[PDB]
Amino acid sequence: IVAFCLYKYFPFGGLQRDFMRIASTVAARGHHVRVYTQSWEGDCPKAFELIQVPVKSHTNHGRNAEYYAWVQNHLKEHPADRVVGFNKMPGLDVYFAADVCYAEKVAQEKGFLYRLTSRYRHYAAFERATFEQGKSTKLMMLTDKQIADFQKHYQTEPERFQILPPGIYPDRKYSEQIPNSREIYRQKNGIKEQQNLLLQVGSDFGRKGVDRSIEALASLPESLRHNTLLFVVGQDKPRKFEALAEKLGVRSNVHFFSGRNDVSELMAAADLLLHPAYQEAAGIVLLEAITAGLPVLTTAVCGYAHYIADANCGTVIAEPFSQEQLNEVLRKALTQSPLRMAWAENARHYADTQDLYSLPEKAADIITGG
């Protein structure tokens, strides 16, 4: 019996999609998968034993504490062979690091008033419980930067870390698309031949720099701008970003969608992925774009940004972030067809020659070992 803990399941988040693939791989190996969550949105595999954990606190952190306590009591009466968490909390045998190091985020970005809060104390305590010395929890990591951050703040025993390769779903790959996918999916989405389709995918618009993408779109010269659309796709509220697009005179250029299950089709249709995130532990969409043959504009703060430079299929904007640099990079990318075509070919080559896929199998090996 392998118990999986994540606070919330929904289909449009990276943590959630990594969990789904890892848990499915574990179940397919013949183990019984139990899932504890506060809420589950979308389809659930029939094989999984899904337990909805009741909570009543009015804060996220209060609910998370309630969840931890409830699951401990349930495990007491209904023991599991291994406990795997996708969120930081006490009691885990294995943790999957979908998130950034909180202690480092706070140290770099927050001040005294932020550290006064019960919320800060909770998230710090639950991260500490997972990473501190003396714990047995195995720590499945996505980047070297994560490891460096956790070592800085917790001095975690190095042997407990294991970096995993990416786990991009093969359905995004250019070679897994129907013939004429670019034409068919552009037509399906109302995209004309002469139009430049910019695509931004992710369920946290603020964190992922949707504002920076809209600013970049608005900065384009008039004729080019008239021919350029931005699709913003994710389970988040568009309001603030609609207001910004209106301010900048590009509301009609920007199309907002809730969570979509056809991202593979949008990537086949698109001309560039824009992902100028403020914060991103890894960024699955960056590598999905690589596999789709879709060139990428992103920011150096993203854990997976280096892959864009490695694949030579776009531009990574350096810190400190310069909007003017993003603006010019966008203008160049849209005006220089040979550059964009070379990037696209480079992406396809990298997707065909690199391991961007084995995460679920390697994670399942760690989880089921012994």
Ligand X SMILES: O=c1ccn([C@@H]2O[C@H](COP(=O)(O)OP(=O)(O)O)[C@@H](O)[C@H]2O)c(=O)[nH]1
Q: Does 297 bind ligand X (CB under 6 A)?
A: no
Q: Which of 203, 213, 228, 253 binds ligand X (CB under 6 A)?
A: 203
**Contacting range for ligand X; rule: CB under 6 A; set: 183-191, 280-288, 349-357, 360-368:** 280-288
Considering only 259, 278, 300, 306, the residue that binds ligand X (CB under 6 A) is: 259
Contact flag: residue 236 with ligand X (CB under 6 A): no
Number of residues in contact with ligand X, rule: CB under 6 A?
19
Sequence-separated (6 or more) residues with CB below 8 Å from residue 155: 133
Among 4, 7, 9, 12, binds ligand X (CB under 6 A): 12
- Which of these ranges, 126-134, 145-153, 202-210, 222-230, lies near ligand X under the rule CB under 6 A? 202-210
196 part of the interface to ligand X, by CB under 6 A: no
Closest CB 347 distance from ligand X, rounded Å: 16
Q: Is 310 helix (H, G, I), strand (E, B) or coil?
A: helix
Stretch that binds ligand X, among 9-17, 152-160, 176-184, 191-199 (CB under 6 A): 9-17
Q: Residue 202, interface with ligand X (CB under 6 A)?
A: yes
78-95 burial code (b ≥16 CB/10 A, e <16): eebebbbbbbbbebbbbb
Residues 6+ apart with CB under 8 A from 57: 63, 65, 66
Residue 352 exposed, middle or buried by CB count within 10 Å (0-12, 13-18, 19+):
exposed
For Cα atoms 328, 333, 335, give the angle at the middle one, nearest 5 degrees.
95
Interatomic CA distance for residues 42 and 51, integer angstroms: 15
When CB distances to ligand X are compared, the closest residue is 14
Residue 84 binds ligand X (CB under 6 A): no
Rounded-to-integer distance, Cα 325 and Cα 318, Å? 9
Chain residues binding ligand X by CB under 6 A are 12-15, 17, 201-204, 233-234, 259-260, 263, 282-285, 288
